[PDB]
Amino acid sequence: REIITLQLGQCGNQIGFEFWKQLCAEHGISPEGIVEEFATDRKDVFFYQADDEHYIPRAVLLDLEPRVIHSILNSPYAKLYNPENIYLGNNWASGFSQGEKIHEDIFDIIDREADGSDSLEGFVLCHSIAGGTGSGLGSYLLERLNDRYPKKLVQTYSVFPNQDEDVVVQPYNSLLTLKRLTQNADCVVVLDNTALNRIATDRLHIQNPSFSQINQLVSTIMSASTTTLRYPGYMNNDLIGLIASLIPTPRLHFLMTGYTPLTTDKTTVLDVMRRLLQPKNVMVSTNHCYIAILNIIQGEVDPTQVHKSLQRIRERKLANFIPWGPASIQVALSRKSPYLPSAHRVSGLMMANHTSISSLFERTCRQYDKLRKREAFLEQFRKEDMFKDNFDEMDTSREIVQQLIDEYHAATRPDYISWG
Amino acid sequence: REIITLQLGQCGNQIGFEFWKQLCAEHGISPEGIVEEFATDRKDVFFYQADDEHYIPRAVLLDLEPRVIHSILNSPYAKLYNPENIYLGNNWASGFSQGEKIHEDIFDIIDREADGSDSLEGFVLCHSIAGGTGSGLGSYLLERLNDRYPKKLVQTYSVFPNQDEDVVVQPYNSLLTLKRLTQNADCVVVLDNTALNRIATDRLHIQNPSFSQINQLVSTIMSASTTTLRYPGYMNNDLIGLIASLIPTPRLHFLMTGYTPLTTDKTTVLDVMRRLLQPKNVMVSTNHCYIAILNIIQGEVDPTQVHKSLQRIRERKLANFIPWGPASIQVALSRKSPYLPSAHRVSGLMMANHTSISSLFERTCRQYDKLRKREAFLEQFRKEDMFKDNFDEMDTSREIVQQLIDEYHAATRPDYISWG
Amino acid sequence: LDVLNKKYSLLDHMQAMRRYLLLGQGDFIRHLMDLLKPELVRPATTLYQHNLTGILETAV
Amino acid sequence: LVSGFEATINKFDKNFSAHLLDLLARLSIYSGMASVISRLDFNGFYTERLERL
Q1: Around A11, how many Cα atoms within 13 Å sit in the side-chain half-sphere?
Q2: Is the separation of the CB atoms in D45 and B322 below 8 Å?
Q3: What element of type H or E holds B122?
Q4: Cα A39 from chain centroid?
């Protein structure tokens, strides 16, 4: 039914602003919400059917120390949506304590759109991991969000914060955010700033406006993830229907992203399926092997050859996916979305459960381990001491991330009929 | 049949002057009473068919310390009506004592128009609550009015006087006026100066000529309340037919006002019905729920879709109106009134019985309670002592307003088959 | 061909038969099973047909 | 005094509610054409007080 989206932090507000602009550009609408004359499709998934034939997006804005919010304010995309949801540190503990005192008023902002909506389906979170203002605040609000409504779903769009060296408190912040990301979130789509920066320096020669182009990438991914919902499809026209197949085990919910063209500034089915399969078109970067893959295709595609394509990708036999119980790489096929001009027609997006993210988790765990052992980089503040005097929240997150690495590695084993 | 209107106080004379001017502007007449050549409709509801083909409005003018009356005098709308009804403090006790001595001559002014009229239907009161000159005088004249003629109806157009802080004697004045407003009045249309001021500062940036624009609002409401009577309709073409359906209990007679466009300087039926239903288009501001709602629509409306509109607003199921015996939100549909230019065509007005006004009553009761307990704000005058030595009229009004809050709250209960 | 293609239609009419009867639109069937939750799980032999058709007309 | 009044109010109210539900019942055999029942019972007030079968 109806999904309410959330954005917090300056990076999260940037990606949400770009997402709403990019769906305004996709749909046959004006930047005021007025429908165009050439419209149809389903436009109730994130758009409130507002009072002047406006499709107002339902977006929760959360900001602290507003810098980008003024730039969002003086724009012709503030006439598209304005639900009056604006409500005013760089540490996780500081953001946690600042979210502590004002939770009731932003919760009134939540309940306003909750009662304004007739139905509710899920909550999408635009949150920047170790983002300074976003960190701590987003973790606290995530905790209160899943506490209040256990009848809904949570997706969180996350980045892996490390530019490979800078800030020494960031592994603590991302670790505490990762603890809540495990136990208070039901689906996590993780992105790599390193992998996106490498692909941006690959296809182009830009490395300085990286945020602006990464906005374009994430908005395309988020729109392609929702095209079967926003346009009349048949399967996973709800969020939960999409989330259900991918997760065999309720803590194995980390979702890998790839995309079949790399440069965006006739081919057949099994071709782009095979290219989406490769890790060098995967834009997020002992054995590591996939649990289950789901893929969506959108473009000009001849539909009758897909079963022979399915056979050819089968006998090509590219991944030795899993031992114990049988998953698959699973296809979904969609139409290329109308109501806008379309270049680079054949475009695919893949959602996969892969244990290879345990390597990145062990990377930031090793960074935390060396910074904890050296003990000159915790940056002891009264915020962190008053939040936790013995700093055993780090210990709880540490044993939980150990359990998750154990879960990954024992799932990679042929025996996960015993738990571990 | 024929309804005689009353206006007293400077604010009441302002709203009556604006009402008569606005109906002169609506009807095809001159400001002298001369009919225009493009006229039909029923023009006997408040207009005397006078002696030069003049439609003279039948309005009782009452004034003390005349300031605005001279401005009403030197105007081209004194050639529209002039029945020679002009007859010359700021306390309720002072206005009560001043009305005491001269009741017979103003009663001759009453009986003059009473014998001048062939039939009589009701008395409308334009009275400003705690208006200084209007307070006390209006209460006394209300008492004599319902005393003399129990065969007619009384409507009183009332404001809720508090600008949220000023004058410390105003809760006493409005309380005594409210006592007579309960037990000596049969229908009360209550307005909020706060809510009207908030909407005026909402749609525009004016807060200083608030009286002048509030005149426009109340005149539009009063004309829209009478459009089915003044133009050929079918139901509630008398006042009493309108009043009968709304009142299930003879002290539950307080009427709430809303209006579907908020700014006045194609949509369908169920749309504007739904928008009239919302409290943020209601221009007057545990559970609180409506007893019964009546609504009138006037505009360009396709008449055949109203039953599907009725179904859609039913299954939208916006208010859980009442327990015990079955009321409804009840529709009336009217034509947009001719003989004048018409902008903002689709306009709706709603009359509702809601218990939420008990909150405003408890507000002014709490103000009276703290001012009575402090006992430096009664402003002891010889007028108040000579009118009531022990000030037990305040006690009688206090137990009656307690009974009314009890009536509201027990009506909100599922049991009002027992009284309370 | 042309008389039936302009006072009614043929291809356009058959597409909606595919959408509803053959369940070619999953969204309508999704909200069909959502909104008609109590009337289905409880026996509809004690209930008239007009209630189901009336809730169906708003369901689409 | 009130032993005539309240008695007549009571018995007339009971027979009135009886015939009211009789009208809704004899219209319930038939089926907008059901706008008549849905309006008379707008927003489900006493769709259920005393219902049979």
Answers
A1: 22
A2: yes
A3: strand B122-126
A4: 30
- Nearest CA to A195 out of A243, A163, A230, A237 is that of A163
Chain A nearest C-alpha distance from C28 (Å): 10
Listing DSSP states for B128-186 in one string gives -TT-SSSTTHHHHHHHHHHHH-TTSEEEEEEEE-------SSHHHHHHHHHHHHHHT-S
Chain C residue numbers touching B311 (CB-CB < 8 A):
58
Question: What are residue A359's phi and psi, to 5 degrees?
Answer: -65, -45
Closest CA to A371 of A177, A191, A175: A175
3-state secondary structure chain A: CCEEEEEECHHHHHHHHHHHHHHHHHCCECCCCCECCCCCCCCCCCEEECCCCCEEECEEEECCCCCHHHHHHCCCCCCCCCCCCCCCCCCHHHHHHHHHHCHHHHHHHHHHHHHHCCCCCEEEEECCCCCCCCCCHHHHHHHHHHHHCCCCEEEEEEEECCCCCCCCCHHHHHHHHHHHHHHCCCEEEEEEHHHHHHHHHHHCCCCCCHHHHHHHHHHHHHHHHHHHHHCCCCCCCCHHHHHHHHCCCCCCCEEEEEECCCCCCCCCHHHHHHHHHCCCCECCCCCCCEEEEEEEEEECCCHHHHHHHHHHHHHHCCCCCCCCCCCCEEEEEEECCCCCCCCCCCEEEEEEEECCHHHHHHHHHHHHHHHHHHCCCCCCCHHHHHHCCCCCHHHHHHHHHHHHHHHHHHHHCCCCCCCC
Residue C19 token pair: 């959408």
B56 Cα distance to chain centroid: 22
Q: What is the largest CA-CA distance in chain A?
A: 65
| B340: exposed, middle or buried (Cβ count in 10 Å: 0-12, 13-18, 19+) | exposed
Q: Exposure of B397 by Cβ count < 10 A (0-12 exposed, 13-18 middle, 19+ buried)?
A: buried
Taking the C-alpha atoms of residue A297 and residue A291, their distance in angstroms, rounded to an integer, is 20
Q: Do D35 and B307 touch (CB under 8 A)?
A: yes
User: Within an 8 Å CB–CB cutoff, is residue C24 touching chain D?
Assistant: no
Structure token digits, residue B37: 């050549």
Which technique?
Answer: cryo-EM
Token pair for A23: 């769906």
Q: How far is CA A166 from the centre of its chain?
A: 25
Q: Quick check: A232 contacting C, CB < 8 Å?
A: yes
CA-nearest residue to C49 within chain D is D31
